[PDB]
Amino acid sequence: PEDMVEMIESQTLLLTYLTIKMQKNLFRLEE
Amino acid sequence: LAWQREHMWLALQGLGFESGAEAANAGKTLVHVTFGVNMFDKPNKDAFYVVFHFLFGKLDNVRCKEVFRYCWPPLDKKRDAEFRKACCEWLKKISDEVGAGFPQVVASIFLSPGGPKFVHLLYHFARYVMLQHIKRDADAGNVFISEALQSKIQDPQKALARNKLARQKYLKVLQKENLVIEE
Amino acid sequence: VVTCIRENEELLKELFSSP
Amino acid sequence: MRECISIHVGQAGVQIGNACWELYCLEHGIQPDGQMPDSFNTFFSETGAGKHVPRAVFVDLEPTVIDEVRTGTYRQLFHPEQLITGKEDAANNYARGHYTIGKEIIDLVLDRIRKLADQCTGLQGFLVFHSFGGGTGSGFTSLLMERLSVDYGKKSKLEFSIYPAPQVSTAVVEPYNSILTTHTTLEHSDCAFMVDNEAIYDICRRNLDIERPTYTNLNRLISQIVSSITASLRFDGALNVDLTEFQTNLVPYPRIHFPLATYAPVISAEKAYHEQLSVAEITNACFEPANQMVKCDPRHGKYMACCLLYRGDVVPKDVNAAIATIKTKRSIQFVDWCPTGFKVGINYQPPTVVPGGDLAKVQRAVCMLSNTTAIAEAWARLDHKFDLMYAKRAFVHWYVGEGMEEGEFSEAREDMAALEKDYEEVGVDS
Amino acid sequence: MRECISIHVGQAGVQIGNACWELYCLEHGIQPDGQMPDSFNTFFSETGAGKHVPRAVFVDLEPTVIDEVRTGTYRQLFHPEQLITGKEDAANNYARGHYTIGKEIIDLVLDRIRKLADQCTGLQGFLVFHSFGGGTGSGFTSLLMERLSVDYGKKSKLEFSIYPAPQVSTAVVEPYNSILTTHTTLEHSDCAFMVDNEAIYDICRRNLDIERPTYTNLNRLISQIVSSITASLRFDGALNVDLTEFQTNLVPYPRIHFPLATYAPVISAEKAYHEQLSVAEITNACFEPANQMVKCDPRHGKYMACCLLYRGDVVPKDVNAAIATIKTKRSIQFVDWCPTGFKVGINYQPPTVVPGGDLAKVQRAVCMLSNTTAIAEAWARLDHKFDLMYAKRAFVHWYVGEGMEEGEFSEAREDMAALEKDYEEVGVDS
Amino acid sequence: MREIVHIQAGQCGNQIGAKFWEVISDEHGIDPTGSYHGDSDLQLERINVYYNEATGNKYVPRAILVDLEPGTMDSVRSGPFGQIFRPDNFVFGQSGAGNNWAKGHYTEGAELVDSVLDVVRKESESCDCLQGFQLTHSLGGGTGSGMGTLLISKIREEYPDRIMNTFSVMPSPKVSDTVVEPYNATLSVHQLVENTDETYCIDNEALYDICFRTLKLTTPTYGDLNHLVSATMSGVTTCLRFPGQLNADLRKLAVNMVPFPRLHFFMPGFAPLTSRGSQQYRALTVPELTQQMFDSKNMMAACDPRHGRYLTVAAIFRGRMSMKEVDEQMLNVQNKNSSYFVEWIPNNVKTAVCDIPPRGLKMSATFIGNSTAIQELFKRISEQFTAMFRRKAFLHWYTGEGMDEMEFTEAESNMNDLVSEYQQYQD
Ligand SMILES: Nc1nc2c(ncn2[C@@H]2O[C@H](COP(=O)(O)CP(=O)(O)OP(=O)(O)O)[C@@H](O)[C@H]2O)c(=O)[nH]1
Ligand SMILES: Nc1nc2c(ncn2[C@@H]2O[C@H](COP(=O)(O)OP(=O)(O)OP(=O)(O)O)[C@@H](O)[C@H]2O)c(=O)[nH]1
Ligand SMILES: Nc1nc2c(ncn2[C@@H]2O[C@H](COP(=O)(O)OP(=O)(O)OP(=O)(O)O)[C@@H](O)[C@H]2O)c(=O)[nH]1
Ligand SMILES: [Mg+2]
Ligand SMILES: [Mg+2]
DSSP: OHHHHHHHHHHHHHHHHHHHHHHHHHHHHHO | OHHHHHHHHHHHHHTOOOTTHHHHTTTOOSTTSOOSSTTSSSOOHHHHHHHHHHHHHHHOSHHHHHHTTTTSSOOSSHHHHHHHHHHHHHHHHHHHHHGGGSOOOOTHHHHSOOHHHHHHHHHHHHHHHHHHHHHHHSOGGGTHHHHHHHSOOOOHHHHHHHHHHHHHHHHHHHHHHHHHHHO | OHHHHHHHHHHHHHHHTOO | OOOEEEEEEHHHHHHHHHHHHHHHHHHHTOOTTSOOOOGGGGTEEEOSSSOEEESEEEEESSSHHHHHHHHSTTTTTSOGGGEEEOSSOOOSOHHIIIIISGGGTHHHHHHHHHHHHTTOSSOOEEEEEEETTSSIIIIIHHHHHHHHHHHTOSSEEEEEEEEOOSSOOSOSSHHHHHHHTHHHHTTSOSEEEEEEHHHHHHHIIIIIOOSSOOHHHHHHHHHHHHHHHHHHHHSOOSBOOOHHHHHHHHOSSTTOOOOEEEEEOOOBTTTTTTOOOOHHHHHHHHTOGGGOSSSOOGGGSOEEEEEEEEEESOOHHHHHHHHHHHHTOSSSOBOSSOSSOEEEEEESSOOOOOTTOSBOOOSEEEEEEEEETTHHHHHHHHHHHHHHHGGGTTTHHHHHTTTOOHHHHHHHHHHHHHHHHHHHHHHSOO | OOOEEEEEOHHHHHHHHHHHHHHHHHHTTOOTTSBOOOOGGGTEEEETTTEEEESEEEEESSSHHHHHHHHSTTTTTSOGGGEEEOSSOOOSOHHIIIIITHHHHHHHHHHHHHHHHHTOSSOOEEEEEEESSSSIIIIIHHHHHHHHHHHHTTOEEEEEEEEOOSSOOSOSSHHHHHHHTHHHHTTTOSEEEEEEHHHHHHHIIIIIOOSSOOHHHHHHHHHHHHHHHHHHHHSOOSBOOOHHHHHHHHOSSTTOOOOEEEEEOOOOTTTTTTOOOOHHHHHHHHTOGGGBSSSOOGGGSOEEEEEEEEEESOOHHHHHHHHHHHHTOSSSOBOTTOSSOEEEEEESSOOOOOTTOSSOOOSEEEEEEEEETTHHHHHHHHHHHHHHHHHHTTTHHHHHHTTOOHHHHHHHHHHHHHHHHHHHHHHSOO | OOEEEEEEEHHHHHHHHHHHHHHHHHHHTBOTTSBBOOSSSHHHHTGGGTEEEETTTEEEEOEEEEESSHHHHHHHHHSTTOTTSOGGGEEEOSSOOTTOHHIIIIISHHHHHHHHHHHHHHHHHHSSSEEEEEEEOBSSSSIIIIIHHHHHHHHHHHOTTSEEEEOOEEOOSSSOOOTTHHHHHHHHHHHHHHHOSEEEOEEHHHHHHIIIIISOOSSOOHHHHHHHHHHHHHHHHHHHHSOOSBOOOHHHHHHHHOSSTTOOEEEEEEEOOOOSTTGGGOOOSHHHHHHHHTOGGGBSSSOOGGGSOEEEEEEEEESSOOHHHHHHHHHHHHHHTGGGBOSSSSOOEEEEEESOOOSSOSOEEEEEEEETTHHHHHHHHHHHHHHHHTTTTTHHHHHHTTOOHHHHHHHHHHHHHHHHHHHHHHO
16 A cells, blocks of 8 residues: 555655765765 | 654654753653653643754754744743744644645644644654755755655555665665774 | 565664664 | 631632531520620630631632622621632632632732731641632642641641542542642641542431432531531530640551541431430441441451540440440451550530531530541542543643643652552551 | 616616516505605615605617606606617617617716716615617617626626517517627626516416416516515515625526526416415425426426525425425436525515506515526527528628628627536536 | 623624523513613622623623624614613624625625724723633624634634633534535634634524424424523523532633543533423423433434433533432433443533522523534535535635635545544544
């Protein structure tokens, strides 16, 4: 049903979120 | 939809939900207001204050300190109306900018924060704050990832594939973190 | 799909617990 | 000397006080216009040339019940500033009576009470009539009792309250209120006389043969109990019992001060001609489960300390006889760490009879106050009721909307739980 | 306040106006010379000393019909300025009344109507009475409604029309005009009560038992419908219906405003005795196929919304009961998207009876105004006749000579075909 | 002291308020000119809850009569007990709303509502300690429904901590008089959900049943219906106006009969209601009062209680009665009908008692029910609403007066949500 593709899109969302959050810090950390 | 109470809490931690400090801003104790997942199944107005203030602060800073200047922390009842009228109008604007992607905001949901109707508004609110930060912290060369996420796909195979790409990105980037902090 | 779901959420919660 | 100040809060307390003051006036020969054509000193103050003004204070956050008294037959008795009334009632809300509607009247009633105390030279203690299930009688009484405890301190605060019945109840949010006020009765009271209305209904319909009794009958009965309690200050007898020595004998540990009251003989004037109401007969009718003022089973627990207040034509020899018989009853069992478990006060003045009452004119009367563990059962049932409603957080928006917290709900429930457990523990033997 | 200005154009209109004004004058007690030996305020202005001048404006392109008025019994009623006339009629020509001759006299009647509208403080709207068959009543009425819609804007315009008969036609070019008039009645009118003469002939000869009736009987019936429409304005009753209420409940979509009007009971004097014309019977009569004022079968369509105007000795409960019975009938079927489809108005004043009239005296009357798709059939048949004559270009030169174009005929044809298609569509269920 | 300011709007509301003022004036002993002529002194004790006192010992009702057609103002002024009202309180328009909600709410009512707010500000500041408002209106029209809704919104904005009662009459599917009733009913319910404290849902069909079956009146009128409604209206506030053995004001009833904020829709009822012929065969006692009041054929709203569960019930008794009898009877009702009562609320019934019986009777009883079966009342409307809105029939009036389609969507969705809440708590 839709509830599982919503689960997938939500987890994709969380992956994208946390990844960008740690990227913006690591780019700062390496410089 | 149990995962709605689940992904919310995870997404709550996604914004960096620390039950201690966010309870400390309100000047109240934690033992009297439980946080976590099973916090909005019943009327729970204190957890409502806390999560709503954190969620409005994570998205905006200056205007948040403005519209919630004469309200927070709404400990009394004369100043409580200020909170309930400053938050409802904002949520109504947010829902009108997105439309069908949001539940219609009703002030009555704020008279008793609880039940599935409040959890629905809360999950869509969390989604909105996540997305409007994926709109700002993702690179100018990658802003499309935001709208690529607003594209409500309907087929499961492509959803599988998108998760697949994102999770390999997750593994590689967490591995590069180790490389950078150790080397 | 559920397997990727589980690996996902687990890595999420445990990496959140990193200081 | 030996004065006392009565505080009547809420509608229940105000009406119970109507009954009580009619009784004291008839007892002492004082007319409802004040004049009397000594002992009255324990309740009345002699104002100039023959005017005995009661040492009481009537309160309500609502104008109606006090207005009945201002326009009633006793208007010339109470002096106008004793009757304090608000504007809008607590409306069955602990939070309103305590936090929002309550804070506007508190200094006024406190100023009146202080002016009342500056007139008495041997103040014994306060008597606080109220009701657990109401809004004012719960919240405003909590507030008043806390403030009184701060100001006066070591004075003995005795409260007579209308505890909610198991099945018969008049309000819906009642359990909620009854729990929160417990958080006060543990700390800011010295002895709490809880009385249920359903038990007095059963008493009336069994003893006095009144099929349809109203609140006035029940209030007359409660008033009689109060009169029997304070007679030892107002009269002379063979064995007097003060309030301090009474509290010394009746309360074994600080937390345990919730005794049961029971009056006897309560019979109609008609079955009275056939009864031979000896000292033994009324002494024993006190120990029956059907003559209880609260719905509980004294058989279901063990007694800890009993006080027998005899009134009228009573000699000590037959009191000793009756107490020895009760000692030889196995259905009446006692704790073991109270080898002697009886205080006896004997008084000379028989119990007066109000015109238009249901009780007859009898020569001997007993008021027995018994600290038993069985009272725990009562609390138990009410707690259960709470945990139904609170499970849904029903009606809680009214409370939290009025300056409350949910933490206070949780704390009141935890407190009542610890009280029950302390009772169960003190009951057990060694 | 609540005034309405009734424009009577063309011969048919002027005669239906003679009837209507006879009725209103007799209704409010205003004598034919204007004197009355409030309610009249809707249809009369009170000028000077007990003199009432009707708020009507009689127009015609021919003087004789207005000259009979000016010489008749009501010469003292309409002050001369309102009976506007030209010199030559349109001779059953749309192009003459609309372009050729109407342009010379549109301004006169417009000045007069502006004078009338200025004197009223609560204008409700206009009641345009005309025929579709003639040159004035089609052409000049179209021109007049166009200018009135430009001038007055949102004022509601209710037109009462004489539509041609399926069988009995007194004119030959009639369909042509009756088609061109459509291009106006769609856009510039708000409600159009078309009425066919043949149906009133049949109603007369059957219900009233009038062997051969003339135009005076027909005009009497039409005036009765008009008075029943405006009764809720002039007098007071149980449930009241303005003009805007009428239009709101009766018109489902903009293009759909052609309701059928019907009346009950129209019996003789002799037949009225044996019948007990209660509310149920007249309400069932309004729904009968043979009592319509226009020739069509209401069984062949679906009702969209119907307004019942009850008048006289009418209580609400039996109105409700009769309506419930109408609902539980199978032949009266309703469209689905209108589950609640009955408007009810109840007025207290019974219907008056003109002397020398054909109707009897009744205590209850009903005017039913129904929107049913069945009316489409009417247009169909007439359209066919159009499609016949336009097949041969007959009588068209008379139009082209005076400034009309054949494109205008083709355009009216397309417009009426679109209107039929809209009715066929709105009929269908989901 | 706990003053109540009353507000009428529309023909229905105006006539019901007129009946209300007749009966209440009879209660306190006010004659048609305002001159007190009663016997007991109690009648003057709290006359001020409803009546201002003008000079010369006359009393004027604290009521605001509103409408959009002057005909109703003239009709009310000309009735009996009509000369009591202040002339400066008749706020009328000049056209009427035409059963159009958009006209009452946005176009004309919006222009008239300022005068009404001015009059209510004057009256409310005139009073010592206001306790709330009473809006008597109907939901089916344009003036009543939409105008009273705009008025309620503004009032709540100005006095947020007061009580807000409404004796709104709802449409009924059987006895319908307007084609566009579902639209107005839905659009008004949407706002009554948010801006009122307790809504007493009456229904004309139910009152017709009360009159036809119970009173056996051959031909009932609107007078008898309005009489029943006014009986309930005064029965609610007897305790405000008279003493008793267990008082209960309006905020007491609000705190007791409303478990959650949105569930404030009640159905009223009255007892005793007997015919004339059947009167001498009846024992006027407390058991008969309670048996009649808890019957389903006696409710003033066309919803069967047997289809849901009483979340809460309030009984206001009037007269010299025993409290043992009252309480035993309430417990009996609850125990015999244990299935019609929810389980997470013990003791669903609140009882109050006033010492003064109504005019002519020795005792009476008023009943207020917060029940889940009221959801039926809304489902009906919703169905009808959808059946029209799908095709967008009659929508162009509402649109041409400035509304939107998004507003109809929101109104439907909110009515559905209220229905879902009630059904959820029914279990
Ligand atoms: N129980 C009662 N119902 C009434 C009464 N009068 C009218 N009604 C019903 O109320 C419904 C419509 O009420 P209203 O006439 O007030 C509509 P309103 O005037 O407020 O708006 P507009 O008239 O369209 O401007 C309709 O069903 C009436 O039958 C009454 O006196 N009592
Ligand atoms: N024995 C007895 N019980 C009463 C009396 N009056 C009220 N009660 C009971 O006490 C409880 C209600 O207490 P109330 O006096 O009504 O509450 P309150 O003190 O007025 O607080 P408010 O709600 O603000 O009025 C119910 O059990 C009532 O039945 C009385 O006169 N005698
Ligand atoms: N029902 C009814 N129809 C009438 C009446 N008078 C004329 N008609 C009909 O109306 C149609 C003709 O319209 P007319 O009014 O005669 O034409 P006109 O308005 O004078 O315009 P011109 O032809 O230019 O004179 C025919 O059906 C006539 O029979 C009447 O009094 N009652
Ligand atoms: Mg002509
Ligand atoms: Mg109206």
